[PDB]
Amino acid sequence: RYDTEHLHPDLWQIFDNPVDWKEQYIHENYSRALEGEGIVEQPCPDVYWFPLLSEQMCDELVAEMEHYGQWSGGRHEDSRLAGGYENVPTVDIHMKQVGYEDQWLQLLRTYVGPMTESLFPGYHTKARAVMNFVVRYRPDEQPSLRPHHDSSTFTLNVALNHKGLDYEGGGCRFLRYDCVISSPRKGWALLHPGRLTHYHEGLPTTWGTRYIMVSFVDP
Amino acid sequence: RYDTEHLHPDLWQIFDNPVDWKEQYIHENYSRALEGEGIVEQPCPDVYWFPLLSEQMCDELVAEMEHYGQWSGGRHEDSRLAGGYENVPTVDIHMKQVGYEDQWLQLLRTYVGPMTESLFPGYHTKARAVMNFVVRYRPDEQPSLRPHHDSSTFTLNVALNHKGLDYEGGGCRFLRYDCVISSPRKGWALLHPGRLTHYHEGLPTTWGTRYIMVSFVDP
Ligand SMILES: *[C@@H]1O[C@H](CO)[C@@H](O)[C@H](O)[C@H]1NC(C)=O
Ligand SMILES: *[C@@H]1O[C@H](CO)[C@@H](O)[C@H](O)[C@H]1NC(C)=O
Ligand SMILES: O=C(O)CCC(=O)C(=O)O
Ligand SMILES: O=C(O)CCC(=O)C(=O)O
Numbered sequence A, B: 001r002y003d004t005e006h007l008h009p010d011l012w013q014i015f016d017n018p019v020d021w022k023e024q025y026i027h028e029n030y031s032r033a034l035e036g037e038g039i040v041e042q043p044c045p046d047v048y049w050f051p052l053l054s055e056q057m058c059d060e061l062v063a064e065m066e067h068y069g070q071w072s073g074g075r076h077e078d079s080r081l082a083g084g085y086e087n088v089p090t091v092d093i094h095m096k097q098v099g100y101e102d103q104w105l106q107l108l109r110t111y112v113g114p115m116t117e118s119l120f121p122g123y124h125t126k127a128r129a130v131m132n133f134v135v136r137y138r139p140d141e142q143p144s145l146r147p148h149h150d151s152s153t154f155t156l157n158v159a160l161n162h163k164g165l166d167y168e169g170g171g172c173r174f175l176r177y178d179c180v181i182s183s184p185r186k187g188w189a190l191l192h193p194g195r196l197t198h199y200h201e202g203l204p205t206t207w208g209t210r211y212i213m214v215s216f217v218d219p
């Protein structure tokens, strides 16, 4: 079965041919990082930086999302939320409306779980996520977020476009540690707990346009 | 109204006469530690050490606990748990048996809450807890625990007697930082997240008997 009603219908082949899917899409530095020869960085305590996605994932994903185009979100209330009251709103496209959510849960189950289990010894996961979306920061649509906290055990944060060549801005800002992340990488991911210890704030974009993928796993 | 069918009935006066209850039982230095002129210590990353209970409350609580006698617990399976299986058993007296549950929840709601809201800015608590007990460590019946995690946002650890004078043992040992807590004080408290980034293990006791008090707040 190979449906062709997509710009890149190959992206749906995660179930059918997982090995070639990983070969094409997953960043080539992932396996070496997982087996433990460095690569991963700890810019701040209890924060880790390991590369996950290759450029093809990034460009094809932004292509698909821009093909959808419908940039909902921004209002403090919500209908996608059962409670109907977002703590902070963002202009977002959730994976539920695109139909890609199941593949994303499969990706989180297979290629992120082991990384966290090896990074935090003694922690056991099943990689359950309910809220997952891609956020766009534009200097005119929406500024960066206010300081807040995340309703999940830890949050997976992945960039989607190259800083400088397309946009200029900043990354995260950890208040309690005076930590600033200033140069996000295109193919890397950020892992940090977001319930109690880490009060984080978003740095403001100045020129260009940036895309960020965020997921809440283990709520 | 006054119930005199207790060894120390004044312990149950946290609802009628809050001010005198606080003046007699709560450690005197609590207010100073709350308003922020030191005292509160951070021996290891994201762990805190501030005084909560004075000597009178500790001694009376210990005596009232030992009066009950039935130091149950020890089997891997459980009857006090809805699921019916402990991950790790320890000799404990759940407060629900002795009736002190409501007053303990009141104490957590009144005194701990503001203190933990001050320590971690941007966090809002309701001090709702389900698991709360007192564990007796003894070199004869049960030594210390295997390394593990906790099923709560953060845990409160309070000692109930003096080190060296009545027991010789050890505190906690944090695996991911190589942190050792050498000398617990009598009435002080220990706060630390207990789900993701604190893989802690308790040291074993060799001489005499020691008491600690735990509460898994914010399930
Ligand atoms: C993968 O890591 C190696 C380490 O030497 C590096 O040479 C290579 O450029 C990396 N691949 C990338 C960044 O796509
Ligand atoms: C409370 O702190 C003061 C600090 O000046 C100290 O003098 C006093 O002994 C403390 N109370 C105790 C340890 O019970
Ligand atoms: O959109 C969100 O609320 C999560 C993203 C966030 O706060 C962050 O990127 O740190
Ligand atoms: O037995 C337990 O789980 C409570 C005791 C504990 O975790 C500790 O001693 O730190």
Ligand SMILES: [Fe+2]
Pocket (backbone or CB within 6 Å): A149, A150, A155, A194
């Ligand atoms: Fe966040």
Ligand SMILES: [Fe+2]
Pocket (backbone or CB within 6 Å): B149, B150, B155, B194, B200
């Ligand atoms: Fe514990």
